[PDB]
Amino acid sequence: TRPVRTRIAPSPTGFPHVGTAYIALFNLVFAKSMGGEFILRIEDTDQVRSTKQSEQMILDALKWAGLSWAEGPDVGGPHAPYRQSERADIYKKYAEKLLDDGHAFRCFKPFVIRMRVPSSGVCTIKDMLRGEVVIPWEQVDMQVLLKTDGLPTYHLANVVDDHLMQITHVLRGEEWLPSAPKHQLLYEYFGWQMPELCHMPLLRNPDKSKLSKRKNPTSITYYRDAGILPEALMNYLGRMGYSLPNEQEKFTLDEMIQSFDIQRISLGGPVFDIEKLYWLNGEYLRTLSVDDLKNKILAWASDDTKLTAIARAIQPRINLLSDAINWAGFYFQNLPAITAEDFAHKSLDNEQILEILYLATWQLENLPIWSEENIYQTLKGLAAHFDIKLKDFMQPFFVAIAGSTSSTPVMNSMYIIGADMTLARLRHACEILGGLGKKKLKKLEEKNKSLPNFLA
Amino acid sequence: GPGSMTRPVRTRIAPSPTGFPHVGTAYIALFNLVFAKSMGGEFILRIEDTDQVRSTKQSEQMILDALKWAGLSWAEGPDVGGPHAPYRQSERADIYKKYAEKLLDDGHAFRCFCTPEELDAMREAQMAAGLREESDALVAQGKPFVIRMRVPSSGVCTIKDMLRGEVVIPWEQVDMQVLLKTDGLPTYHLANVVDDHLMQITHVLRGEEWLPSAPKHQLLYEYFGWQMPELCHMPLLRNPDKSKLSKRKNPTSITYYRDAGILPEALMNYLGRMGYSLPNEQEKFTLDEMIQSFDIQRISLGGPVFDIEKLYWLNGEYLRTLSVDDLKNKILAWASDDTKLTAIARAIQPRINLLSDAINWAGFYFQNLPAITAEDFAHKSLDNEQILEILYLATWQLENLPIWSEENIYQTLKGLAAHFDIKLKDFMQPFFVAIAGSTSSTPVMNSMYIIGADMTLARLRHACEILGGLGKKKLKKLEEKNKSLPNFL
Numbered sequence: 001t002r003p004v005r006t007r008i009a010p011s012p013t014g015f016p017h018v019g020t021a022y023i024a025l026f027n028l029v030f031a032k033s034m035g036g037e038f039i040l041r042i043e044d045t046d047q048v049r050s051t052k053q054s055e056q057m058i059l060d061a062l063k064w065a066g067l068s069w070a071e072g073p074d075v076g077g078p079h080a081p082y083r084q085s086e087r088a089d090i091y092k093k094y095a096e097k098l099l100d101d102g103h104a105f106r107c108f109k110p111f112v113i114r115m116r117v118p119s120s121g122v123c124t125i126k127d128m129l130r131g132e133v134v135i136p137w138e139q140v141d142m143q144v145l146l147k148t149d150g151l152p153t154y155h156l157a158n159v160v161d162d163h164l165m166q167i168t169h170v171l172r173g174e175e176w177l178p179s180a181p182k183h184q185l186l187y188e189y190f191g192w193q194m195p196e197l198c199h200m201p202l203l204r205n206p207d208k209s210k211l212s213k214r215k216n217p218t219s220i221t222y223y224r225d226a227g228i229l230p231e232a233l234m235n236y237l238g239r240m241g242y243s244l245p246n247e248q249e250k251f252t253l254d255e256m257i258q259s260f261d262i263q264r265i266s267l268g269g270p271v272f273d274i275e276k277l278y279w280l281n282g283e284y285l286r287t288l289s290v291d292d293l294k295n296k297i298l299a300w301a302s303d304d305t306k307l308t309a310i311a312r313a314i315q316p317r318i319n320l321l322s323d324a325i326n327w328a329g330f331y332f333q334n335l336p337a338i339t340a341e342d343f344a345h346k347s348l349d350n351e352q353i354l355e356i357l358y359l360a361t362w363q364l365e366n367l368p369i370w371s372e373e374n375i376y377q378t379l380k381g382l383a384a385h386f387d388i389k390l391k392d393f394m395q396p397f398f399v400a401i402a403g404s405t406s407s408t409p410v411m412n413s414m415y416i417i418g419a420d421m422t423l424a425r426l427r428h429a430c431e432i433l434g435g436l437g438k439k440k441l442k443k444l445e446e447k448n449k450s451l452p453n454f455l456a
Numbered sequence: 457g458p459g460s461m462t463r464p465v466r467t468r469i470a471p472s473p474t475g476f477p478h479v480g481t482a483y484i485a486l487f488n489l490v491f492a493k494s495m496g497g498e499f500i501l502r503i504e505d506t507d508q509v510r511s512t513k514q515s516e517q518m519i520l521d522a523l524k525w526a527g528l529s530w531a532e533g534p535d536v537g538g539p540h541a542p543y544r545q546s547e548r549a550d551i552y553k554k555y556a557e558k559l560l561d562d563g564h565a566f567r568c569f570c571t572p573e574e575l576d577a578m579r580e581a582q583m584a585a586g587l588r589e590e591s592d593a594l595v596a597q598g599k600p601f602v603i604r605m606r607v608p609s610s611g612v613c614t615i616k617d618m619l620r621g622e623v624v625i626p627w628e629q630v631d632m633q634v635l636l637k638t639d640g641l642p643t644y645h646l647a648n649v650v651d652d653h654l655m656q657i658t659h660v661l662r663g664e665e666w667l668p669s670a671p672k673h674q675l676l677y678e679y680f681g682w683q684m685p686e687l688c689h690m691p692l693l694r695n696p697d698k699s700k701l702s703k704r705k706n707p708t709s710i711t712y713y714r715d716a717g718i719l720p721e722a723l724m725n726y727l728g729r730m731g732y733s734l735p736n737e738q739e740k741f742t743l744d745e746m747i748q749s750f751d752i753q754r755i756s757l758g759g760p761v762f763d764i765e766k767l768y769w770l771n772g773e774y775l776r777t778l779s780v781d782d783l784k785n786k787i788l789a790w791a792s793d794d795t796k797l798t799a800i801a802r803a804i805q806p807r808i809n810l811l812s813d814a815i816n817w818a819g820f821y822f823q824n825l826p827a828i829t830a831e832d833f834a835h836k837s838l839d840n841e842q843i844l845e846i847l848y849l850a851t852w853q854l855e856n857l858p859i860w861s862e863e864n865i866y867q868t869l870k871g872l873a874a875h876f877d878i879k880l881k882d883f884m885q886p887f888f889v890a891i892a893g894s895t896s897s898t899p900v901m902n903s904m905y906i907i908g909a910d911m912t913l914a915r916l917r918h919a920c921e922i923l924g925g926l927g928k929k930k931l932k933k934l935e936e937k938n939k940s941l942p943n944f945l
């Protein structure tokens with residue numbers, strides 16, 4: 001055959017997603033079972049949305065989960081650079097070869113290169129799991145390969161980098177199956193061998209919808225912060241679309257590798273029941289030594305939360321070393337115990353309060369960098385646009401973030417617990433307060449886009 | 457002034473190791489240490505374990521550890537050694553016997569074939585308003601005797617106080633104190649004079665409670681032909697209500713404030729301010745600053761009040777003057793040392809499904825006094841007046857435990873529930889709230905073992921205060937029952 005080589009190719013656009021870890025697990029397990037290697041390629045082709053910080057978050061998140069790669073942006077490799085943004089020169093020449101070869105045309109002076117697509121026939125793709133995929137060529141668009149800025153699109157860079165990095169198997173979400181005919185065609189146009197394709201079912205919520213941050217948290221780093229062990233999380237993800245022989249519910253990475261058979265992957269959309277993940281974490285915690293449990297609690301508290309920042313926040317308010325527990329306890333909880341009645345709506349109407357927390361969630365979600373200043377500018381700008389006094393605007397945030405009406409300055413608190421935990425606590429607060437109906441929620445999303453950029 | 461001293465200055469703290477180390481012992485130790493260092497002299501420690509039934513080896517280590525934590529240190533003592541070792545009175549029994557006999561030979565002490573409890577009956581005897589070869593023969597017969605000191609029947613005693621001037625006490629008010637007991641071991645009064653003379657103590661600062669005993673000590677120094685040390689009687693620390701410092705309102709144990717999060721520097725700063733004020737009225741100062749500007753005459757004689765709230769505020773001032781980095785390290789060090797985390801992890805493991813739950817289950821281990829209300833204890837099965845009775849007896853029984861070990865806590869509480877014929881499940885219901893602040897928590901008896909003796913007792917007495925306590929009359933009945941109870945161990 002040929003040396004097996006798999007990959008995870010995360011687009012560093014936003015929070016590190018559990019789904020990205022789901023795919024990363026099944027690519028690493030597949031490779032190792034076949035004596036191959038697992039590499040990581042950062043796909044930062046969306047220049048405006050891809051951030052250097054978001055790249056470091058994903059590498060840190062997967063390393064924490066226990067995944068590792070033989071070649072990548074950090075470790076290096078014979079196929080460096082491993083960021084697509086630093087491969088811009090490579091893609092341009094191949095796109096020009098597609099123009100000379102009679103396989104691409106320009107569409108409008110500013111120009112974009114587009115691929116030629118057959119006008120009649122079918123595309124037959126072999127999926128390792130679903131069998132055979134047939135797609136009419138007429139339902140395949142003439143996708144843009146090189147943009148006006150000279151930078152690549154996803155479809156061009158994936159084919160060039162997979163071929164140059166000698167990828168032999170690609171496992172990715174079934175969302176990318178409609179793009180597969182484009183990929184076969186590009187490999188033919190370049191005279192290259194297309195890797196074998198296995199499309200994976202997409203993780204779902206309990207309501208059978210697609211996994212959404214709305215219904216259940218979706219960030220890898222949130223589960224770190226909430227107290228989930230990385231060994232438990234990876235165990236749960238390997239159990240989602242897949243079952244080990246004999247239906248073992250708790251297993252290690254090495255156990256998954258040895259008995260790994262791609263055909264055991266179910267096609268139903270796996271449901272990410274956070275409660276079942278929590279129980280499994282309980283099993284991992286109870287099978288630990290008391291010494292190990294102690295050391296794991298201390299490490300979980302020394303790394304995620306910054307203690308020098310917690311000390312500075314509580315110093316004005318503690319008169320005894322024993323007060324630290326009552327003033328800094330919420331920094332180490334997951335979701336403070338709150339009730340609807342706690343939001344006294346004495347300054348703001350309850351319907352107002354919901355609108356403040358929803359808009360604050362979305363605005364804080366898209367922050368380029370999680371700094372106390374960016375939090376302050378965003379929340380001050382939001383209170384400015386609606387003409388509410390800031391102290392009255394922040395009243396709900398004391399309840400949602402700290403679980404009490406009195407605490408250290410809530411904005412430094414949000415900076416300390418982090419982006420993932422702040423948003424998890426805001427979304428929880430909306431749910432306790434009943435949320436807003438589908439009709440009201442869409443209207444509020446409209447205003448969110450009409451809002452200014454509170455940081456420009 | 458240091459130069460106007462006849463002899464090298466030497467002070468002392470002489471704690472009786474008969475329970476938890478009390479803040480008062482730290483107060484006195486501070487002013488003897490500061491006085492000595494100010495005069496170029498030395499501070500020593502002598503353990504006064506003459507009450508054998510009440511003195512514990514554990515209690516001796518408790519005081520030495522407590523004073524070292526507070527920042528006190530001594531040039532000579534049971535641990536460091538010294539030219540006048542041993543520094544435990546229990547190991548100086550030989551010395552006291554001979555000096556007690558010398559007082560018999562000089563005719564300054566007499567033998568009484570009474571025994572100390574019989575003597576108390578003799579002194580209580582009713583009498584009208586207006587009023588030895590045989591003893592040696594009784595010594596041959598082996599009858600038990602106690603040596604007693606002779607006291608003049610008429611006249612006055614003038615005691616020189618460094619602060620009060622001259623204190624005059626009619627000799628009629630001075631009893632013929634026992635110097636040697638039936639066992640041949642010393643009493644406090646004989647051992648103090650003999651040891652102070654032998655350890656070359658030049659100044660003695662001690663509570664004003666000992667002022668009535670001063671005439672006796674002056675008399676013994678005369679009988680031995682020894683120079684009496686100068687006496688400076690210190691005002692006694694008081695409660696906010698102006699009573700003598702009592703455990704009811706606030707804990708009196710040095711180690712409780714360590715466990716509660718008071719820094720040692722803040723506690724010594726507060727104690728240095730109680731009867732005394734630095735020049736220029738600095739409210740916050742270090743030990744060395746106190747030494748440099750120390751003047752014995754600045755000690756006020758009004759009873760200082762030990763306001764726990766003011767101690768807490770001063771501790772806050774110490775916390776704010778720390779760098780954020782130092783405050784971090786001090787909080788962590790305070791939590792790693794006293795409580796062992798391996799036991800807390802053991803306790804929460806059966807109950808936590810997330811690492812984040814650890815904070816909610818183990819928070820009470822690091823709190824000082826959990827937030828409690830009367831209503832928290834009452835939706836249970838037991839009447840409040842019962843609950844109060846359970847907590848008071850549990851406090852006293854757990855206080856007198858020889859060792860703080862989970863089995864001893866278990867035997868004590870199980871026997872108490874047996875004597876009341878209350879089921880253990882209902883008997884422990886109040887202790888869950890008093891120790892953890894909730895109806896559901898880790899097993900409370902392991903919890904009490906972990907937080908320690910001081911914190912367990914502080915939280916139980918607090919539980920009594922919120923529940924209103926028991927009246928003075930109700931409390932007397934309960935103390936009677938406490939002694940009538942069997943040994944639950």
Ligand SMILES: Nc1ncnc2c1ncn2[C@@H]1O[C@H](COS(=O)(=O)NC(=O)[C@@H](N)CCC(=O)O)[C@@H](O)[C@H]1O
Pocket residue numbers: 009010011012019020022023043158171172173174175176201202203204210211
């Ligand atoms: N709910 C879900 N359940 C399960 N898998 C899910 C998922 N959402 C996304 N994925 C899958 O996660 C992987 C990485 O996602 S991602 O960062 O958005 N990057 C991308 O989608 C592209 N870089 C795809 C590259 C490729 O695979 O060829 C991709 O393989 C993507 O299909």
Ligand SMILES: Nc1ncnc2c1ncn2[C@@H]1O[C@H](COS(=O)(=O)NC(=O)[C@@H](N)CCC(=O)O)[C@@H](O)[C@H]1O
Pocket residue numbers: 470471472473480481483484504648660661662663664665666690691692693694700701
């Ligand atoms: N509330 C209070 N405020 C302030 N000082 C107080 C105090 N209660 C006790 N003291 C003082 O503490 C010192 C040691 O106390 S103790 O362990 O009971 N030992 C004794 O009283 C004697 N063995 C001391 C002998 C001596 O000094 O000559 C003794 O000096 C004692 O007077």
